[PDB]
Amino acid sequence: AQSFLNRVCGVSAARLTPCGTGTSTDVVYRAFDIYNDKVAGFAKFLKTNCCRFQEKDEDDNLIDSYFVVKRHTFSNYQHEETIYNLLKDCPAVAKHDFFKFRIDGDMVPHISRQRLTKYTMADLVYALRHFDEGNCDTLKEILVTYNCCDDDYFNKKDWYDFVENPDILRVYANLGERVRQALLKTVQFCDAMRNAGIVGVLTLDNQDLNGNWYDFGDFIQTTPGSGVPVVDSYYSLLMPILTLTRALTAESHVDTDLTKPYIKWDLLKYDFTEERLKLFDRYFKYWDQTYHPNCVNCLDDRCILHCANFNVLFSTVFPPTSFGPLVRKIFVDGVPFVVSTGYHFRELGVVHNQDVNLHSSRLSFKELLVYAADPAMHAASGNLLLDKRTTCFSVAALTNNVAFQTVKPGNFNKDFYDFAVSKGFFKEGSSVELKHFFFAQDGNAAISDYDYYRYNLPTMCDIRQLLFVVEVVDKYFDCYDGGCINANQVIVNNLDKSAGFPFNKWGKARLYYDSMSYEDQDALFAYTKRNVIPTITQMNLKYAISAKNRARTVAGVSICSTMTNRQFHQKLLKSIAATRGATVVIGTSKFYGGWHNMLKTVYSDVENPHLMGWDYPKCDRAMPNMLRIMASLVLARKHTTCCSLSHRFYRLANECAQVLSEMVMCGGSLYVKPGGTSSGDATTAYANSVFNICQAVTANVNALLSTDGNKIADKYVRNLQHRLYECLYRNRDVDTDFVNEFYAYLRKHFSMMILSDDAVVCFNSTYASQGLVASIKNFKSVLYYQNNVFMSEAKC
């Protein structure tokens, strides 16, 4: 015992305190990334085989420095010894011992790994992904250990929620530089493994919170100079934490250190391609897939997503001013103009128009229509604005005064009220009581609603999981059909509706549909397939009854977007709205037995049926950018024939340019919308349906891979788990067979009925209890780490 402790300390001469009684191991409960030929998954197990020794400091203080010793056979001892004395000089490598000790009466080899931390990054990842309000423990310990916060902070009410505690983002940000250091150190590990010829799979199980790597028990060696570290599961599982913890902030400072001031970029610099490649080289040097700084050069939709993810990460570095429309001066009839000619998307990069006309002669009706719609000229003519009422970037003010809008109290029908009271209603102790009213608002309503678009943050999504989710979701829209239509096939519900800021001043949408011919409409539609047209959406204060004093607003979008999204999603969506018996239920009436038919469809062959419902905290103002791009993409998938790739990409560019991050004029002033979605385009409800389906399926996958995988009984489900892991983190291409099988699995065991942001699911109880399908817990975890919102019990 005493000699064992004296040997573990060895030449180090530390003050090892045996946090484990005698020469016995210490079984801990830690998360692992496992892939054998039997079981696969990222799940938390029980670890034997190690005895731990915390180091003591001078004044009997205990520091997070542990001497983990591993007991195993002789074969592994030799295997790790012969490959530890190959890469011993890499700073990313923890120092090993490789001794032998006379445990009991026989000789056993032990490998002493020295100076690790209590938790590896696997614990951090599993804690921040699979969160529980009442099972934090390890998250609290990590968060307090590294002087990010204090313990009395955890006594705060709803400390863990982003919405009503906007300080929790600051707390997580104090852990951020450690992850940057870990990546910056694992890059040299990869380089040394290359230089010395080692082949294997790096996992975030064997990397400490310092960044040191300490396990080689599954590795093989080859000729030096050609090593292939398989960084595929590692980066994929580590993605979300980088943007949740804001781990790249150091790049905003000069010389990459938080102490020094920020880098003062040139205001007129708009193309940051070189910096994007520089950061990608610095931090993800060994990521096999190619990277396109500008999403124009992508090969198809999947490469668009894969490049957009890294762009979303890197866009937190560059100044906020260099994002938006790109203006150029063009003379028409000798008159210099200021017209939009290109755009700088945070997620897509730089896109230049192809049909820009310089030194034109006359402006036809379509040219005047376009040059009067984009905010370029209105912005270049206005005066600079600075508003302290909100945090989101502001552009300018069109007028010389700021108009203030309010709401009216709503009128009272005393006749019906008296007739009701005379009928024994509205008395004391009644189960019926007035809970719906026409509330009023002050002169600050919309500006108090835009700080709800404040709640949206730059978000990365786990990219490989997201790609597979796109593939599986693509099947739920397989029975539908659509494609481009000419100007003669559009059908408009009501023509007496407003057009927008720079059009409402003169007429209504009837005037514009009936002034320009069909040929002009087709010309504009074809123009939008090789350019970008920024627009302005007006923000409007709704006037209706509600159960809570919230000033809900609506968005009146401009008319160019109306035509150029109608001519496309009209045929896409009229198929959806007229189809019965599908998961999407939009366009079906509840009357004439429709509601009963819906419910009978929901209960379609559910074995152990139970019902579950949820509601997202703020569906419209928190939806991360990537999921909206995904919705637009899976809606645009139905154009494999009618258009080429560049046309699809430009349509998506216009969609994200006038619905995602556009300029809203609220009270006579232009503000930039950080993200979210605008209710008032042609495709809000269906996009929200797509988002709901995506969240449900990703919750299902995250649930099924969180399971142990050894206690699982049915061989079919175990094979499903193994192949699902293989298809997520080990396949570069799509597998139609397995996605077919998996879609069949969910449709059999987990049935959904979806309308806009609201959902009803019938699910198998046994599978949920065994963790085979998603439950309320997994779904809440998914919302937490992919929407920056914590759902409570009052919404589910």
Binding site: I34, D37, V201, I220, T222, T223, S226, V230, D232
Partner: protein
């Protein structure tokens, strides 16, 4: 316990050459991954110094696909014939995982020095 590649990947002979139609008849040890959506080869092994083109007819036989290769990767292996110094090649676009599994299979199932 993330194991590199359970189950081994076997080989089959194939044709390669330096350029255009230089694939003569049969010169390469193609290590191939059989998927029922079509046989998809991973690696090429040769005693020929510089082969950048490789050839394989499709299943129908009316077409014949060409594949491109990396710069040669040197190694030497011990066999009954003594030391044999060979070059392995990978098709461009090959992810790191396929390289990892093929090198694991080679370094486990083939003697090397």
């Amino acid at each position: 316990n993330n194991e590199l590649s359970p189950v081994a990947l076997r080989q089959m002979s194939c044709a390669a050459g330096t350029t255009q139609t230089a694939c003569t008849d049969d010169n390469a040890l193609a290590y191939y991954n059989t998927t029922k959506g079509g046989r998809f080869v991973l690696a090429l092994l040769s005693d020929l110094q510089d082969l950048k083109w490789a050839r394989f007819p499709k299943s129908d036989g009316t077409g014949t696909i060409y594949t491109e290769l990396e710069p040669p990767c040197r190694f030497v292996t011990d066999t009954p014939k003594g030391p044999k110094v060979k070059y392995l090649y990978f098709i461009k676009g090959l992810n790191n995982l396929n390289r990892g599994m093929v090198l694991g299979s080679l370094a486990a199932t083939v003697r090397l020095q």
